[PDB]
Each structure stands twice: as structure tokens, then as C-alpha cells.
Amino acid sequence: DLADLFPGFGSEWINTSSGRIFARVGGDGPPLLLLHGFPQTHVMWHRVAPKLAERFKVIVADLPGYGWSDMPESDEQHTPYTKRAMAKQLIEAMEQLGHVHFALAGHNRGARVSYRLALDSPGRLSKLAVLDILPTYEYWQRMNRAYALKIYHWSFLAQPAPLPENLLGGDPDFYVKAKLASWTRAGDLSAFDPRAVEHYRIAFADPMRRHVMCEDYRAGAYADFEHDKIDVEAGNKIPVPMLALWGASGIAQTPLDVWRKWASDVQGAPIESGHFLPEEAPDQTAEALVRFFSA
Amino acid sequence: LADLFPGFGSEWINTSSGRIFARVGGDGPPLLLLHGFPQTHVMWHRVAPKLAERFKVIVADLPGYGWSDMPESDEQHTPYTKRAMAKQLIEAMEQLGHVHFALAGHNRGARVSYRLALDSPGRLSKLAVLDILPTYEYWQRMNRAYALKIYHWSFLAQPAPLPENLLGGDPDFYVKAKLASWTRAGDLSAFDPRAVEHYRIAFADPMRRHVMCEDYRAGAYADFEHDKIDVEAGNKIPVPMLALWGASGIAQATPLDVWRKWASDVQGAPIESGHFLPEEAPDQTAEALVRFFSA
């Protein structure tokens, strides 16, 4: 059995037109939605969510298709796993709780859902934080030999099915543990609570969950990139006050200079960390978020 | 299993780095044929007979491929660099008394071949390369579109053991998917099933797959650097050269225009074919090669 890493938090299974969203819910105050990414689940926030819950009503949700959220059937354009669709789905979920204007922090895929949400539906957000990402358009635009080799999984997981699925199926534990370790500052699993690692491992052990992850990266290579391209070529900037927090040894890395192209009111800082800020640097991440969302 | 070369002998040729296996047939001027990935010498079985009508034809397994020995690699992937492979095949040809010969290569073998022509042009009377551009040129072109289309250049080049671990789960699937995906038909129908079995059998060995990954690691690092030095120096191949490519192959972004920057005497032509010219279009490939190599 898997551990409860949010002692005292409630658990909700929220219906939407696209399927259920699982969330842990805690605290009180202004509403704050937290969105994980790949290859994780909502439990990645367990080291910062208790502290945030001292100041906010904290909703820690599994992305569409991840963790214990339902997995909609995909299609030829990977539609349910595009960040545009994921953002619509999470907007519906928040409405089910009575939240139509909320604060939002995301990491990895969830940060992409978050800035896409801000571009499509800025009225929904009071403030936005994105953790260790650049826009999907910027990742692809900088593509060259060095980046192709340094950060290969974007193009690998986006290959047509069932190629990535069949490769991942032989020994899935090895792949998910290798990715978790590889993107940390030290390159091992020491930053992670082993109970959290087991949550990630159990999700990754389901071929249906792995297929969703590949669909997510297929969206990332195609429709998500196209959606982004339209905004940057039109000069659309996010007007929601924004924080870009990144790891000095992360994937996104200046990110603030990139984000200033995409957002008219953005602040930012690095933290000494690899990619997984809320687990590698929980006190600093929690502090940065509390201070940003409270101001 | 299955002998696909009527009237060819079988030879193990000694070198300082290990044995090279080759099928040997015909008489007349010497012509070396070099396969690539994920194949073996048997890929030439539909064109070698026609060539052996006019030439002494040596159909070799690349160093570390097929039945050739596998020299131990190192941190710089040295023995599977094209410079090293070319030196090893030059030694093998010297064992047969061939110090000036014609050479045709496909895929990795065509990279060995143009590297051989750049390093040791005195060894070659004429050179044909099938459906490739220089490694430098593919990497220079590695934008989003190319990262997606030739993802395996970055995936197979990831540090060991990441691709080795993934390929071990279902190697038959991967090799058959690669074979099919690069043909015009998109299935295995262009191949002799007996040939496919040769490729599957080789790919079934973890040691052979490791060699392939070392080959792509070389392709991402030393091979690229070697090419970059020639580009910077403005070096061109002086050997009479033929570039053949598939109308729906990988090299095509205009192949003859590219090769003219790398070679001072080159002619070329498209063939209605996917990547695997000698199997998808054996009659037209053989005819083109015969006419070119004939004096």
C-alpha cells in the first residue's frame, strides 16, 4: 500500500466532462492549485504543501491521465493530453469546488498546463508560478545538436506509438528511477522521500499510465508547440502576475529573460537545485511561493 | 541461417583489431561493399551478384557488426568511430592485397566510406554513398523537425546503459520497426524474409546492440568533430564519387548540393525508394553502381 504524504489533507475525486481529477485538499484561505509533471504525481508537492496550507486553501491535483486521475482515450492529435485541453479540464475541476479565480503553481508538464491556462483563460488566475520550465516553443526553437543530446526524451517519447511504449515496457522501474535521478542536482535518488518514489514507480508501472505520458510528449512536440507558436508570433503576452522559479542545475537553464518575452509582469529567481525544486529544495521553494502568492 | 550469395565464398579476414567477416565473389577490379544499421552484409544480396559480373566483390560486416569480431570500446568510443572503422577495413583489404579499390557504402557503412576517402583518398579509385549526408550536415540540421525524424541519433547516443537497457526488452520489435519505418512501404515487404532473419538474429545479441550504441555515440561526438575539422579546413574528397539517395529516403535539403560542398567530383541521382536502396530498388541501384564503377 502507498503512503499518505499529506497528513490531515482531504481527498477529492472531482468530476469533469473529460474525466475525474484526483486531488488532495488542505489548509484554508485563498485557493491555490498545484500541478505536478513527468514522471511524477501530485505527491511531489508533499514537502511544500503543508507549509503552503498554513496560508492558502491548497488543491494538489493529479494531471489529467496521471496518478489516480482518469485517463481519457486519446486521438490522432493527442487532444486530451495537450496543455490546452488539460487546462480546460482543470478549470472545470476548480469550478466544481467553487473556484473561478485562483492562484496556480506548476512544475514540468503541470507548469506547461499552467502557462497555457494563462494564455487561453487569464481571467481564471490571480497569479501564476512556473517551476523549472521554459515555454514549449522555446525548448523546440533552441533545438540543435547539443540540446538534442542533452535533453533527448522530448523527441524519443514523441515517436509514434507503439515505439516508446514498447521500449518502456521491458523494465519500466529502471527508466523512471533513471529519469528521477538524472535530473536532480546530485544525479541520484537522495533528494526524494522513498515513499514518494514508490508512488511514482507504481504509476509508471501501469502501461496505460505510460501511454498517457507518451501522448503528453506527443502533444508537446505537435499541438502544444503549434499553440505556443501562434502566441509568440502574434506577440501575445501573459498579463497575469507571474513568477518563474528555476533550478541552477535544472532543465530550463536566463529563463527570466525568456519569460519576459512571454509575460508582461514576471519576476524570477534561480534556486540551487536540479529540476525537482519542491523536493530538492523544499524550504526555499515553499518560501518563494508563499511570498509571491501573498504579495 | 540461409546463404543469400550464390557463387560467393566466406572469409574471415584478420586485422590488428579483430576479424572482419566477408562474403567474396567475382573477379576483376576490387569493390568493397559496406552495410549499415540495423543490418549486416546480407543487405547487399540483391545487388552483389550483378556487381560480381564485372568486379571482385567483397561484402564485409562492419567492425563489431554481424559476424565480425567486436573490439573493446573505450570512453571515446574509439573503435566504432568511422575513422577507426576505416583504418580497420583498410587493414582487412591489405590482407587480400587490395591497396586501391572501389567502395560503396550504405547508412553507417557510407559514413565509414566517406571518412575513409577524407583520411586516405589514395586507397580509393571511386566511391559511392547510398542515402546519406555527412554526419556533420545531419547534426547542423538538427532542429525540431529533424530531432523528431531522426530521434535515434540522440537516443542511441545517450550514455550507457540507457539505450541498452531499453533495447533488451523486445529487440525483435525495435529492429523490425526500424527496418520498416525507413522503407517507402512502411512495412517489411521490401525485404527478403531470410535477410530480415539475419538482421533479427544479430540484433538479438546484447553485445551486438551495445556495439550499435557505441557507433551512434561515436556519431554524436568524435565522428562529428572529425567532420567539423574537414569543414573548417575546406577539405573535399578528390575521389570520383557517386551519391545515390531515395526519393523518400533520409538524405533528402538537396543531397547533390550538399555533397558538392564535400567533394570535387561527384554525380548523383535519386532512386524511387525509401532508405534501403539495395533492397527496395535492387535493379536500379545495381545498374547505377555498375555504370559508375565500370571504366
Ligand SMILES: [Cl-]
Ligand atoms: Cl523547458
Ligand SMILES: [Cl-]
Ligand atoms: Cl546512417
